[PDB]
Amino acid sequence: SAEHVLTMLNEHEVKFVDLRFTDTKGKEQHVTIPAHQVNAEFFEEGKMFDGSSIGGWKGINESDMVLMPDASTAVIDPFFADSTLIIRCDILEPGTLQGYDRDPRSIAKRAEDYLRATGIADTVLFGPEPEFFLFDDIRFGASISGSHVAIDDIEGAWNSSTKYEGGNKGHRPGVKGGYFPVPPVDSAQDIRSEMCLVMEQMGLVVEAHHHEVATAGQNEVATRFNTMTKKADEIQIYKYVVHNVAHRFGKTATFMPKPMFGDNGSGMHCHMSLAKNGTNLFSGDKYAGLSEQALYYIGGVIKHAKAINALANPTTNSYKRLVPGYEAPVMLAYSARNRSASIRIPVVASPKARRIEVRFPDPAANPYLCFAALLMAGLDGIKNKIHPGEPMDKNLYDLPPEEAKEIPQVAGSLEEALNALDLDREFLKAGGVFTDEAIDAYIALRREEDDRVRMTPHPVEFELYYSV
Amino acid sequence: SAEHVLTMLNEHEVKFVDLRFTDTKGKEQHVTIPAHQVNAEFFEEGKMFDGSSIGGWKGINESDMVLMPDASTAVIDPFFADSTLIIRCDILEPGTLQGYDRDPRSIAKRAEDYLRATGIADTVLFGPEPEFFLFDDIRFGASISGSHVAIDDIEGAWNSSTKYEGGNKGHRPGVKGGYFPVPPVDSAQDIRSEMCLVMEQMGLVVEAHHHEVATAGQNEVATRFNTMTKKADEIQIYKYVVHNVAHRFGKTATFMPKPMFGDNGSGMHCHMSLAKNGTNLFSGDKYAGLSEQALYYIGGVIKHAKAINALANPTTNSYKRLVPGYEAPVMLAYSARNRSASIRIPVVASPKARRIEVRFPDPAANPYLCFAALLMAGLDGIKNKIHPGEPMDKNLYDLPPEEAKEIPQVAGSLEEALNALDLDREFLKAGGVFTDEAIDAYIALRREEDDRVRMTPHPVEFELYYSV
Amino acid sequence: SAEHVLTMLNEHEVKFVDLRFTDTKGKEQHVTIPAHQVNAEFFEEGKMFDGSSIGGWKGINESDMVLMPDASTAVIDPFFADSTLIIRCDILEPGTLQGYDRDPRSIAKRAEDYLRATGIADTVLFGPEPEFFLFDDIRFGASISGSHVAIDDIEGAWNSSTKYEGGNKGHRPGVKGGYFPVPPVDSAQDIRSEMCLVMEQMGLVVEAHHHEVATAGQNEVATRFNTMTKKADEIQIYKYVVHNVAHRFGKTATFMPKPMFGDNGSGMHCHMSLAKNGTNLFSGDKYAGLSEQALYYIGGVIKHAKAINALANPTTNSYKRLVPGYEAPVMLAYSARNRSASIRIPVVASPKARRIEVRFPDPAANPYLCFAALLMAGLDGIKNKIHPGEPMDKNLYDLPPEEAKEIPQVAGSLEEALNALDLDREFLKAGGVFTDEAIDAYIALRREEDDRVRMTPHPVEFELYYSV
Numbered sequence A, B, C: 001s002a003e004h005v006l007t008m009l010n011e012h013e014v015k016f017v018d019l020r021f022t023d024t025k026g027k028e029q030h031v032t033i034p035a036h037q038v039n040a041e042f043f044e045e046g047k048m049f050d051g052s053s054i055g056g057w058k059g060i061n062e063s064d065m066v067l068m069p070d071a072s073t074a075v076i077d078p079f080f081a082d083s084t085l086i087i088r089c090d091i092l093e094p095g096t097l098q099g100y101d102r103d104p105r106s107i108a109k110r111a112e113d114y115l116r117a118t119g120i121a122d123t124v125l126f127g128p129e130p131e132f133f134l135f136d137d138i139r140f141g142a143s144i145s146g147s148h149v150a151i152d153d154i155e156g157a158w159n160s161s162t163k164y165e166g167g168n169k170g171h172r173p174g175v176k177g178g179y180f181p182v183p184p185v186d187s188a189q190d191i192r193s194e195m196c197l198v199m200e201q202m203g204l205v206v207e208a209h210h211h212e213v214a215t216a217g218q219n220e221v222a223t224r225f226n227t228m229t230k231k232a233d234e235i236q237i238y239k240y241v242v243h244n245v246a247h248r249f250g251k252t253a254t255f256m257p258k259p260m261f262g263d264n265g266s267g268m269h270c271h272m273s274l275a276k277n278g279t280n281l282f283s284g285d286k287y288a289g290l291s292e293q294a295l296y297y298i299g300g301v302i303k304h305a306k307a308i309n310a311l312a313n314p315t316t317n318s319y320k321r322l323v324p325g326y327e328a329p330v331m332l333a334y335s336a337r338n339r340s341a342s343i344r345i346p347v348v349a350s351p352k353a354r355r356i357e358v359r360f361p362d363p364a365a366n367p368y369l370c371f372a373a374l375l376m377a378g379l380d381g382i383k384n385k386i387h388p389g390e391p392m393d394k395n396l397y398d399l400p401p402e403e404a405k406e407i408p409q410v411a412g413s414l415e416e417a418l419n420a421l422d423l424d425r426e427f428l429k430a431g432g433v434f435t436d437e438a439i440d441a442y443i444a445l446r447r448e449e450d451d452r453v454r455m456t457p458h459p460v461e462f463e464l465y466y467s468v
């Protein structure tokens, strides 16, 4: 409703409207217009902007594109000083007003459409669990003469020896020791709740909040699932709230997957399930309460895992979390117990809540593209009745080590994932959801990133080879 | 209305009246008088002041001149502590009360007059888009033993490694990475809006605001077009608001065109169109919805580009933005897509909004003189039916590089532009708008500036030649 | 003599041989081999080295080239710790052993050959007067956030206020006040003499040494002329001695033409004359004791001045010395008095010493290429009997200012000079001395340098336009 919006403008005495959207990498972008620029036209024809400015979008000749406000997304910004209303927008091709091939939100919408079209189900449910870190100081750089990164937080175990102005009060979570010590060891209760309250003021529904495993401020706010595209929207808002509440509290938050070697990384498990006319298409008589549809879905995810990685773990850093470790969600298998398996099956009573949990995604992932790729892989698993095989209930990557334990695994590097995405792109092009151009552009953006890391000497290389 | 003014004095309990005007370089100037000095005389005969004090104005013998308040410009100053009313003034020759040959506002008015006189149209529309930078620290100097410039801002990418008192919160726009990351990466939302609110309190109409491309605080406030002279007035107010809101927020703003090598410069694109009795003389059946009048106008701009440069890019620094780069608006051509072309043709639906966008101007330009020169070149393009030739839809300055790609280009240095202005002055003298004396004086002011830069050793020269 | 060399090896118990050569920019380069690697082969076939490593030389496919030792140049290095013999080398094309088109020494030799060939004379005489600066501290840099240059020397007038550890002894040359105050005002007597003694130990013949005009260590060592190519060799040695004696004394020397705005730059006047069978072809009955041949030579130099500039003033910095100043050697004219004229005619008694002094060259110039271009221009002046016109005995660039005083002048910027060289290249290609490829390569090297300076914001631009 465009009318609901015009009343929210008066009800909150809005002075500005902040138009938001996401780029290919997954980063929320914005531009602001005075409330008085919002008229009838605005909703039917949107506003014009330069495409060539966003990475991986229009090139030299076709710059101009359309910002189409989605009136359903209207929500007040809780941080800006002057009353302002946020309105998420889709990026449409001018004239045709179609929906840009490279617009991640359009792509996600297309994927929800294709779901309904195949008639396999009418709605997809996503419940991602993004984790994050809260620090006090983050410093880094790289130039010809070197490079570095320094992290600091009042909770960091390393500060047990630090001299502080008013004395070191020393109650800190040790390495891997953040799972639930009550305050003062946990220094983020008040902040986690503000994040919750604010998230809810912005339309999210919070289920829980807690400190995570790592020392130095790993935390998590769990929110209720929602339909795929609305959830990706929620992820963006979620990140926004986290980033800004942290900033307001004198901290700095990051959704990087592995900021520290030696302690937990941050993951973004994704719970999924399908539905039609209110019934859960994933409940059944098969394994752990699953439908055979769920199993085909799983099979799809497993078949296209490496390609999904390119979207669910889009950073070189992502692979520093996905390493032969014990709890590393790297084994392409399912189970209701074995937490070595990248696909957990939650054991729950109500068949209405039956679903699967794909564990390898990380918060760096573009909501839209990550969720979409997960769906398309699932659908292709169904359409082609791809059987999962049997569930792994044994053990992870280490011992096993019997048959060299070379069972399925997620990509081991970004390049590998990008290459998989290159080759295994058909399941994504299905229904015209992902175009080759979009995929090739995405890959090019990430290869440029992959190159920086591959080409820049690493501090550890000096430790290992300076005296060679 | 001089009566409207006398009521604004009582309504706002004004204690002072701040008389404003612009010098040849384009810098707003002012002098203040107590409100009680405002009487009937004031409006009909103005106030006297020393001409010899402003650069490039009256010399040794004819110092005294007149400040003529323009009652239509009355607006309250939003920063001064004591209630004060701003009134823009024109500079008139004493006795004759004509309008000083060297007064940029008089010159701009003369140009609007000449437009109506030729009967080509009755009003000119200007929609400039000045960009600017917001820093925290700016230091520079030059003496016999050296020189330097140091820029600093909390957003500067270089500060990713800086130690801060309360910790580095590190969410900064990388180089060329300022186009729209939401806060906290974008640290200027609150300030851009205050600038908007204040601009509107001062009569401007804001269309949008956003962070620009460069790291370290490049920003932009887009305002609605207006008739030529009123828009130049708006530019002055615009700059004033930007400069002062920044100052009040603990920042410092600059409209310099290229403060940093390696990242975006700041430009001031100028959208233009002509009109008569409410109809847009630029809409037609020709290319991209244009009238043949628009094309002649374009031809004029292209013919006199180098001379216009002397007013639209009046600083040596201006040419550090206009360099063989990809997006450099340096190719003297038009197109609706090719953003290599210094003249873009906005593709819009309503023929009421058809216009041209001359991209090479920068914010250092004198509003008045820059806009005027753009007009006069356009008119001369019409009067002499100067055809544009065909639109460039190929590519920019690099590859092309086929036929050495020596097509039209803007001046490559200030001196070159000044020289062009010298030789190609006829189109400006038309209608007696620009006098030779005015032009020669302007050129002399800028040559003195050009000399400082040409004569002072450049830091890079040491890098390049110290070991020669 | 290759035998004289083999005896110098034993006489001085040489452990190494330092092979030297010059690149296109004019910078001496070197590589060292143990004395035991010097055999008969060495002299007849030289040693192989990678061409692609030097700027502006061989490209992707034809890397390898020959270093041909010139046994006449053997001289002991006075600084190296272990006894080492320096041997200048020419760069020859492999197999053909011809002489690389781009080798500046080969080019200079070719030019001396062509002189003898035309039969105009059998030897060219060059007496350059390079000036230089001696500092204590030189700091500079340029990055995205700024740039700077800081000069410091115990003689700098600015240090009259500096606090020193053992007290400020304050006897310093004021600005433009360095011409001859005896010590202690002149702090470089001992160092200038060491430079002299060492220069002579290396084969140069010193005529005088003295402090120059500028504060902060401008100095000069005057050496006796010699035949063109041998003199360019001497220039290289000269610079080497200056640079290294300075280094050994705790100073740092520079041959940059204008390190400071506000005080003298450093020039390299070039005295020239031609000869055949021991007689001075420049003495005659014409003006000031000149032959008509000398006048044609002058005419040549004047005709091709702008192109010569590209070699005699090859840096952007060069043009900060050649600016409308009083003593600026920028007026393309001759005279025996008017020191406004870039060509002075020394008034001397013995007709054996009659010659011309071209004043605009600076020490940044490549010896070889600068001298060669001067010759070729002179010869073309002769071959085509280019008359000089009449001598200027009036005044310089300022008042005059009568007829706007637009008489001949040297290039006003590097680009202009490079462009002149581009267009006016025929006189250089004469005799196959300079090839188009060589010229185009040189121009490309310098344009890259010109670009750095044109594109990088200048500190003064902030002073002039930050508040725009």
Ligand SMILES: Nc1ncnc2c1ncn2[C@@H]1O[C@H](COP(=O)(O)OP(=O)(O)O)[C@@H](O)[C@H]1O
Residues within 6 Å of the ligand: A125, A126, A127, A128, A129, A207, A208, A222, A223, A224, A225, A226, A269, A271, A272, A273, A352, A353, A354, A355, A357
């Ligand atoms: N179909 C579904 N029915 C019920 N809950 C679902 C469904 N699909 C996803 N979910 C999500 O399960 C997630 C919540 O619980 P959480 O305590 O964070 O689990 P875990 O211990 O695996 O991190 C939420 O995102 C929840 O909304």
Ligand SMILES: Nc1ncnc2c1ncn2[C@@H]1O[C@H](COP(=O)(O)OP(=O)(O)O)[C@@H](O)[C@H]1O
Residues within 6 Å of the ligand: A049, A050, B125, B126, B127, B128, B129, B207, B208, B222, B223, B224, B225, B226, B269, B271, B272, B273, B352, B353, B354, B355, B357
């Ligand atoms: N004749 C005209 N009709 C409509 N708009 C015009 C006209 N002449 C100029 N304009 C100006 O176009 C400019 C605004 O839009 P903007 O989003 O900043 O474009 P761009 O993407 O080229 O920077 C304003 O200055 C607008 O008022």
Ligand SMILES: Nc1ncnc2c1ncn2[C@@H]1O[C@H](COP(=O)(O)OP(=O)(O)O)[C@@H](O)[C@H]1O
Residues within 6 Å of the ligand: C125, C126, C127, C128, C129, C207, C208, C222, C223, C224, C225, C226, C269, C271, C272, C273, C352, C353, C354, C355, C357
């Ligand atoms: N043909 C020539 N006969 C005599 N001296 C010559 C000849 N050609 C060049 N010279 C040079 O004149 C220069 C020296 O004198 P100098 O005192 O430095 O003069 P100035 O006052 O012009 O700087 C030397 O380089 C000297 O050898």
Ligand SMILES: [Mn+2]
Residues within 6 Å of the ligand: A129, A131, A212, A220
């Ligand atoms: Mn968790």
Ligand SMILES: [Mn+2]
Residues within 6 Å of the ligand: A129, A269, A357
């Ligand atoms: Mn989980």
Ligand SMILES: [Mn+2]
Residues within 6 Å of the ligand: B129, B131, B212, B220
């Ligand atoms: Mn802009």
Ligand SMILES: [Mn+2]
Residues within 6 Å of the ligand: B129, B269, B357
């Ligand atoms: Mn624009």
Ligand SMILES: [Mn+2]
Residues within 6 Å of the ligand: C129, C131, C212, C220
């Ligand atoms: Mn001298």
Ligand SMILES: [Mn+2]
Residues within 6 Å of the ligand: C129, C269, C357
């Ligand atoms: Mn001299």
